[PDB]
């Protein structure tokens, strides 16, 4: 099998601060992640698909990197509508499709 | 946006991917001029015939 | 740009079946995947089930093998799951998702999302 | 977090034999692990940085071997003056800098 | 061949405050990282806090997160430690490292280290 984690659950910054956030698996997946945005209100949205390539049409500001068994996920500029909860999942164990835990962020 | 600041950090982590850990690279360029050569070797001198 | 509404929410007692249709407008469907995923009202999002571009290969979760049923109709450009035997733990919020490539298991995740609809199994 | 355990804790030899000492950890560390002597009447002392790299000034009797999981240091001469306590650390996960056990080692 | 000479230590009771001195000569004390780390009496050895090259990034003990400070003066090429709140446990030794890198979390670790001063937290 395979576990994710996330070692933040809540963070704070402000509009012009810069956030980082982990995701550890039980093991190696070999860069086999993807980082997904939910917005409480609409459906969620795909923000990274493998270990560090962006998916068109979103903004540059997300970063994504790590590879084997940890992965992170920063934002340099912090708009004021990035808040929503924040997903990785693994697309390369047996388990199909293992999401991990929510990521809440909020801007204070 | 439309204007991106070209200076970015790495994120060099001690488990990054192989590729993704950072080598350090020196690159040693030589010119050879008619100018006497002030760098040479360690092969040592005898006494001319 | 792509669309993907979905249909069916509702409310029925456990032990009752229901049924979901999503369909797309955006998009070429002949030849993309498609997936059900399930939201908890106070957890994270989980995946249910998935179907290829073509009915060949087709993948359940664990937890719902046997019991749930996923069809696919490429001609009206459309998805359904019918959900049988529902329990008390199946009150959650399911989207559409379609996937980047072709086959059921593979890297490629998740593109494009569509907003859930709403199921509640109670009386 | 990081648990690491000392196997061998106490041993005994000669003048003339060959020792070896293993460290165990809860998960693999990328062969990040250094090797510590602490002599009783002076301050402790580096000699294995790394997976098999030899810390230079100290005699090439100590090898180090093992990568990932599980390491292992081994001494083949034995000589009078080895009279102290083996320490295996990892710097690898997150909590900083973790120190094993002690492990002594004695001739009779 | 460096030099680490260490002060500072003696006996006190619990609840009060002192200062530890580490002074190298040895070497450039201005590019190297800096680290305090404890000797149990009768149990292995383990960290307590470290300082970089320069000033800004610092980082300390699970079981010392607001309780020491760590301060480095480059230009007499000297650091210290401030013991505030001790209570029975800190009487160990305490020993002062020299990281190989210049960095605070890096899988460089000690190269040369110093003898250790002994403290005493009691009535």
């Known amino acids: 099998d395979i576990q994710m984690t996330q070692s933040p659950s809540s963070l704070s910054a402000s509009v012009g601060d810069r956030v980082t956030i982990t995701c550890?698996?039980?093991?190696?997946?070999?860069?086999?992640?993807?980082?997904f945005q939910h917005k409480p209100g609409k459906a969620p949205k795909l923000?990274?698909?493998?270990?560090?390539?962006?998916?068109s049409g979103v903004p540059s500001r997300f970063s994504g990197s790590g590879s084997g068994t940890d992965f992170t996920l920063t934002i340099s500029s912090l708009q004021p509508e990035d808040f929503a909860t924040?997903?990785?999942?693994?697309?390369?164990?047996?388990?199909?499709?293992?999401?991990?835990?929510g990521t809440k962020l909020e801007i204070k | 946006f439309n204007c991106y600041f070209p200076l970015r950090s790495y994120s060099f982590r001690p488990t990054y991917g192989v590729g993704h850990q950072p080598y350090r690279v020196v690159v040693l360029s030589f010119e050879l001029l008619h100018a006497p050569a002030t760098v040479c070797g360690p092969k040592k001198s005898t006494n001319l015939v | 740009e792509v669309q993907l509404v979905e249909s069916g929410g509702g409310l029925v007692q456990p032990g009752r079946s229901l049924r979901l249709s999503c369909?797309?407008?955006?998009?070429?469907?002949?030849?993309?995947?498609?997936?059900?995923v399930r939201q908890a009202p106070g957890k994270g999002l989980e995946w249910?089930?998935?179907?290829?571009?073509?009915?060949?290969?087709?993948?359940?979760?664990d937890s719902v093998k046997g019991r749930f049923t996923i069809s696919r109709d490429n001609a009206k450009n459309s998805l359904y799951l019918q959900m049988n035997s529902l329990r008390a733990e199946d009150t959650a919020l399911?989207?559409?998702?379609?996937?980047?490539?072709?086959?059921?298991?593979?890297?490629?995740?998740?593109?494009?999302?569509?907003?859930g609809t709403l199921v509640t199994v109670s009386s | 977090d990081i648990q690491m355990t000392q196997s061998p804790s106490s041993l005994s030899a000669s003048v003339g034999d060959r020792v070896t000492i293993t460290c165990r950890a809860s998960?693999?560390?990328?062969?990040?692990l250094n090797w510590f002597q602490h002599k009783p009447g002076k301050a402790p002392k580096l000699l294995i940085y790394?997976?098999?790299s030899l810390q230079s000034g100290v005699p090439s009797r100590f090898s180090g071997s093992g990568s990932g999981t599980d390491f292992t240091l081994t001494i083949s001469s034995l000589q009078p003056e080895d009279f102290a306590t083996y320490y295996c650390?990892?710097?690898?996960?997150?909590?900083?800098?973790?120190f094993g056990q002690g492990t002594k080692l004695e001739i009779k | 061949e460096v030099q680490l000479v260490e002060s500072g230590g003696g006996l006190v009771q619990p609840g009060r405050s002192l200062r530890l001195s580490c002074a190298a000569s040895?070497?450039?004390?201005?590019?190297?990282?800096m680290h305090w780390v404890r000797q149990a009496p009768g149990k292995g050895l383990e960290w307590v806090s470290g300082?970089?090259?320069?000033?800004?990034?610092?980082d300390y003990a699970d079981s010392v997160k607001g309780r020491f400070t760590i301060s480095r003066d480059n230009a007499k090429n000297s650091l210290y430690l401030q013991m505030n709140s001790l209570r029975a446990e800190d009487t160990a030794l305490y020993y002062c490292?020299?990281?190989?890198?210049?960095?605070?979390?890096?899988?460089?670790?000690?190269?040369?280290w110093g003898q250790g001063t002994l403290v005493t937290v009691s009535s």
């Open positions: 300082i970089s090259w320069n000033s800004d990034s610092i």
């Open positions: 998960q693999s560390i990328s062969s990040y």
């Open positions: 040895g070497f450039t004390f201005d590019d190297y990282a």
């Open positions: 650390q990892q710097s690898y996960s997150t909590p900083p800098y973790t």
């Open positions: 790394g997976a098999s």
């Open positions: 490292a020299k990281d190989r890198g210049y960095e605070i979390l890096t899988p460089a670790s000690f190269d040369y």
